[PDB]
């Protein structure tokens, strides 16, 4: 609570969010974004939580074109609870407030959504989000310049057997 | 991605100007989204953000515009491990055998029957990070294995960094804010401000190794191929510590490239070196920036930017909307000569006619010459010593150039490459008279929209990456958020588009509206002031609380 935002949209659905603080600003951003892109964010959060195979089976791929099960192993490893906790503890109060607001605004849209702009209405993976989910997305972006480019290679790393 | 910042010495108005042309995915977790954020009195910034991140990534404010491009710096290092000769799950550091750590993760998998099964997977880790296997290149055998240390795993500053950038007043303030926090993971930053400063920074999170350590700590075979790789059996090859760095083991801000100018700076994903050739950036760590041949996009930009004439907004816009295939400048004159030398060869007739008629563009109406040229270039790239003038470090803007047709073996191989390219084009399903916009499209529901631009590897500034799907090339990435910002007295004047539109959802009214505009190359005002916003006849407003 204490979450409030004023949103204006100009041509082509560009939002202009005004708020008195970061929590309200995040609230407006999460709500406006969800109106346009709820399905996208839910799918990418499933990916960053390492839950693709749970919803979609091992036959599918992520939007990064990695197989679901290797992608899940990689993100389960990347986004372990200890790592998320340490990341959160290092965030400034302003950043924490932006993220808390964003999750609440996205979730507000989901509570009210009737399918007008949301094609995945009713899917089991379209779920309320948590600030931890936004940290999972942040960490996924962080490693795009490093270990994320070696995700398949990390999953493939197994010690030698008895071979010649 | 491309970026050009123009300063007071080259802009027509004597103030700053910025062209932002990031090349990013059209789908997924890196799909840009436009927004304007305001906390009255202390924050007012507009641009585009990435999914789930409540900050503007590329944007502008009252006196400043900035953008980013992917850099050539290393943001990780591989470590080659020497394994314990008695145990391949142990590795040696200074001759001492250490055990690998094991971290198991468990994943639920939905089966054929619809039920969940649990899969457990072991991730092996060294003191550097997890082990990685690239079959036939980075193996884990009984002698060696590779671990990967990613510098951004410890970068907890990334969100704070962009929130700070969003609050930056001018170029000097932006530089202070970035150098102070060092939270940028893997991009360059270019910016311009109202007073006419143009800034380039290669200020990101980069593993630090003191210069005296590099010759012995590098893996010679891998660094030769551009892979950051170090000797993991020697404790002296640990990332160096410097108290001035924001994070243990990263390069201090003072050692990373910065160029502040009043004429221009540019980057198209090459190193810092030729950001502005009047002041080359040299002498950095090989992990940071190297003097390598520049790509055709940077060569194109420098060809348009060098000289003394003022640059207007329209000039920068037209660098994007021209869809000029700059790589054709390097080879098409000699290709046409080869064509004339082989008049009456049936295997070359259609290709040579298509190439001669071609506008050297990737416009919607560009002829099939572009397709012949692309298939030829993919084959030319595999030829040995076919350049008439190879890369010359003393002439990096104009080399390589031309085909060495005077060399018989090259002439034979080039002609064969063109015959082979022609055979491939003619095999595929291309109706005669069809144009580039007939082939390259973005699907929107049951419909398609023709998309101008072409691959950045062919020197098209408006870079578009596509993949074959059925009868068409489907756009998957490239030009995304465009912003062109100038600074007239009344407030920032910004123009651009989000090529793939605000919404990824087919149901949305904003699923293809800007994509129709992008097809027609009709950029629009990005409204920022209350006056601009209130003038929009489509204006809607909602206030929400809980
Ligand atoms: C940390 C993400 C920064 C992304 C900005 C865009 C860079 C580019 O256009 O290549």
Please, are residues B235 and B290 in contact by the beta-carbon 8 Å criterion? no
| H or E segment and range at residue A39 | helix A22-48
Please, are residues B49 and B33 in contact by the beta-carbon 8 Å criterion? yes
- How far is it, in rounded angstroms, from Cα A31 to Cα A69? 31
Resolution of the structure, angstroms: 1.7
From ligand 1's centre to the CA of B228, what distance in Å? 21
- The secondary structure of residue B295, as a DSSP letter, is P
- The secondary structure of residue B294, as a DSSP letter, is P
Please, are residues B40 and B300 in contact by the beta-carbon 8 Å criterion? no
Q: After which residues is chain B broken (C to N over 2.5 A)?
A: none
A115 and B507: CB-CB below 8 Å?
yes
Q: Which residues on chain B are in Cβ contact (under 8 Å) with A154?
A: 123, 130-132, 148
Beta bridge partners of B442: B449
- Nearest CA distance, A162 vs chain B (angstrom): 10
A119 and B505: CB-CB below 8 Å?
yes
Could you state, in order of their start, the residue ranges of all structural domains in chain A? 1-164
B267 lines ligand 1 (CB under 6 A): no
Which residues of B form the catalytic set? 1
Kind of pairing, strands A14-18 and B33-39?
parallel
The structure was resolved experimentally with X-ray
- How far is it, in rounded angstroms, from Cα B188 to Cα B274? 13
Please, are residues B272 and B257 in contact by the beta-carbon 8 Å criterion? yes
Q: Which residues on chain B are in Cβ contact (under 8 Å) with A72?
A: 107
B478 lines ligand 1 (CB under 6 A): no
List Cα–Cα distances, A133 to A45, A84, A119, B484, in angstroms.
6, 9, 21, 33
The token duo for B220 is 């010679």
Kind of pairing, strands B464-469 and B493-498?
unpaired
Q: What is the DSSP string of B402-459?
A: EE-TTSHHHHHHHHHHHHHHHHHHHHS---TT--HHHHEEEEETTEEEE---B-GGGT
Fold annotation for B293-474: 1.10.1400
A33 and B34: CB-CB below 8 Å?
no
Could you state, in order of their start, the residue ranges of all structural domains in chain B? 1-75+151-290+475-536, 76-150, 293-474
Sign of the CA dihedral running B427, B430, B432, B437: negative
> CA dihedral in degrees (B66, B72, B75, B78; nearest 10)?
170
A95 and B163: CB-CB below 8 Å?
yes
Ligand 1 atom with the shortest distance to the CA of B184? 1
Fold annotation for B1-75+151-290+475-536: 3.60.20
The token duo for B424 is 């491939």
Long-range contacts of A65-74 (CB under 8 A, 24+ apart): A66/A151, A66/A152, A69/B107, A69/B109, A69/B119, A70/A151, A70/A152, A70/A155, A71/A47, A71/A151, A72/B107, A73/A155, A73/B105, A73/B107, A73/B121, A73/B123, A74/A50, A74/A148, A74/A151, A74/A154, A74/A155
B68 lines ligand 1 (CB under 6 A): yes
- Nearest CA distance, A17 vs chain B (angstrom): 5
- Nearest CA distance, B137 vs chain A (angstrom): 11
- How far is it, in rounded angstroms, from Cα B432 to Cα B434? 5
The residue whose C-alpha atom lies closest to atom 5 belonging to ligand 1 is B68
Please, are residues B236 and B181 in contact by the beta-carbon 8 Å criterion? no
Question: For B326-378, what is the HEC assignment?
Answer: CHHHHHHHHHHHHHHHCCCCCCCHHHHHHHHHCCCECCCCCCCHHHHHHHHHH
Q: Which residues have CB under 8 Å from B97's CB, separation 6+?
A: B84, B86, B87, B90, B91
Is residue B248 less than 8 Å (CB to CB) from chain A? no
Kind of pairing, strands B76-84 and B229-231?
parallel
B70 lines ligand 1 (CB under 6 A): yes
- How far is it, in rounded angstroms, from Cα B328 to Cα B324? 9
- The secondary structure of residue B321, as a DSSP letter, is H
B502 and A54: CB-CB below 8 Å?
no
Substitution target in B27, B37, B48, B54 with the highest count of A β-carbons within 10 Å is: B54
B413 lines ligand 1 (CB under 6 A): no
A147 and B186: CB-CB below 8 Å?
no
- How far is it, in rounded angstroms, from Cα B69 to Cα B72? 10
| H or E segment and range at residue A35 | helix A22-48
B1 lines ligand 1 (CB under 6 A): yes
Substitution target in A12, A53, A62, A71 with the highest count of B β-carbons within 10 Å is: A12
**How deeply is B78 buried, as exposed, middle or buried, from its count of CB atoms within 10 A (0-12, 13-18, 19+)?**
buried
CATH architecture of structural domain B76-150? Roll (2.30)
- How far is it, in rounded angstroms, from Cα B74 to Cα A146? 8
What φ, ψ does residue B429 adopt, rounded to 5°? Answer: -85, 80
Fold annotation for A1-164: Penicillin Amidohydrolase; domain 1 (1.10.439)
Return the number of other C-beta atoms located less than 10 Å from residue B253's C-beta.
18
Ligand 1 atom with the shortest distance to the CA of B3? 9
């Amino acid at each position: 609570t204490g979450l409030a935002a004023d949103i204006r949209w100009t041509a082509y659905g560009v939002p202009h969010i005004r708020a008195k603080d970061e929590r309200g600003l995040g609230y407006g951003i999460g709500y406006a974004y969800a109106r346009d892109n709820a399905c996208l964010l839910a799918e990418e959060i499933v990916t960053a939580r390492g839950e693709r195979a749970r919803y979609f089976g091992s036959e599918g791929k992520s939007s990064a074109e990695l197989d679901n099960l290797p992608s899940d192993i990689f993100y389960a490893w990347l986004n372990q609870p200890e790592a998320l906790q340490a990341f959160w503890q290092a965030q400034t109060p302003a950043v924490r407030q932006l993220l808390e607001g964003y999750a609440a605004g996205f979730n507000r849209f989901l509570r009210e959504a009737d399918g007008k702009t949301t094609s995945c209405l009713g899917q089991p993976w379209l779920r309320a989000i948590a600030t931890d989910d936004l940290l999972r997305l942040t960490r996924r972006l962080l490693v795009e310049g490093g270990v994320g480019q070696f995700a398949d290679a990390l999953v493939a790393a197994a010690p030698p057997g008895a071979e010649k | 991605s491309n970026a050009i910042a123009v300063g007071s010495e080259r802009s027509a108005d004597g103030k700053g100007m910025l062209l932002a042309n990031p090349h990013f995915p059209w789908n997924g977790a890196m799909r840009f989204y436009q927004m304007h954020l305001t906390i009255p009195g202390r924050l007012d910034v507009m641009g585009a953000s990435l999914p789930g991140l409540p900050v503007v990534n590329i944007g502008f404010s009252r006196h400043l515009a900035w953008t980013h491009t992917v850099d050539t710096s290393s943001h990780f290092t591989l470590y080659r491990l020497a394994l314990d000769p008695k145990d391949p799950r142990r590795y040696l550091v200074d001759g001492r055998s250490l055990p690998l750590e094991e971290k198991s993760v468990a994943i639920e998998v939905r089966g054929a029957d619809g039920k969940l099964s649990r899969v457990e997977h072991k991730v092996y880790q060294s003191i550097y990070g997890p082990l990685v296997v690239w079959p036939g290149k980075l193996d884990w055998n009984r002698s060696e294995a590779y671990a990967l240390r990613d510098a951004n795993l410890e970068n907890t500053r990334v969100l704070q960094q962009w929130y700070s950038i969003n609050q930056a007043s001018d170029v000097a303030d932006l530089r202070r804010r970035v150098e102070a926090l060092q939270g940028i993971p893997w991009v360059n930053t270019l910016a311009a401000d109202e007073q006419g400063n143009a800034l380039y920074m290669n200020q990101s999170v980069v593993p630090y190794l003191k210069p005296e350590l590099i010759p012995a700590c590098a893996i010679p075979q891998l660094v030769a191929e551009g892979l950051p790789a170090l000797q993991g059996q020697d404790s002296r090859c640990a990332w160096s510590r410097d108290p001035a760095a924001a994070q243990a083991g990263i390069t201090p801000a003072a050692q990373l490239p910065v160029l502040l100018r009043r004429d221009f700076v540019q980057n198209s994903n090459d190193s810092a070196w030729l950001t502005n050739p009047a002041s080359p950036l040299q002498g950095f760590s090989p992990l940071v920036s190297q003097e390598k041949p520049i790509g055709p996009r940077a060569r194109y930009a420098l060809s348009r930017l060098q000289g003394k004439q003022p640059l207007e907004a329209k000039t920068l816009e037209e660098m994007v909307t021209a869809n000029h295939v700059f790589s054709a400048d390097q080879v098409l004159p000699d290709l046409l000569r080869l064509c004339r030398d082989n008049q009456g060869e049936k295997s070359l007739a259609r290709a040579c006619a298509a190439l001669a008629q071609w506008d050297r563009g990737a416009n919607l109406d560009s002829g099939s010459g572009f397709v012949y040229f692309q298939r030829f270039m993919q084959r030319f790239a595999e030829l040995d010593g076919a350049w008439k003038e190879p890369f010359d470090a003393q002439r990096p803007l104009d080399t390589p150039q031309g085909i060495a047709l005077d060399r018989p073996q090259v002439a034979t191989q080039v002609r064969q490459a063109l015959a082979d390219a022609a055979a491939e084009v003619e095999k595929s399903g291309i109706p005669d008279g069809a144009r580039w916009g007939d082939l390259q499209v973005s699907t929107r529901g049951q419909e398609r929209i023709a998309i101008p631009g072409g691959d950045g590897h062919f020197g098209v500034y408006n870079a578009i990456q596509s993949v074959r799907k059925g009868d068409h090339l489907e756009v998957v990435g490239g030009t995304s958020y465009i912003q062109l910002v100038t600074f007239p007295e009344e407030g920032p004047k910004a123009r651009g588009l989000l090529a793939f539109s605000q919404s990824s959802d087919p149901r949305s009214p904003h699923y293809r509206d800007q994509t129709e505009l992008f097809s027609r190359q009709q950029w629009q005002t990005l409204p920022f002031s209350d006056r601009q916003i209130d003038a929009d006849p489509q204006l809607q407003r909602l206030s929400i609380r809980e």
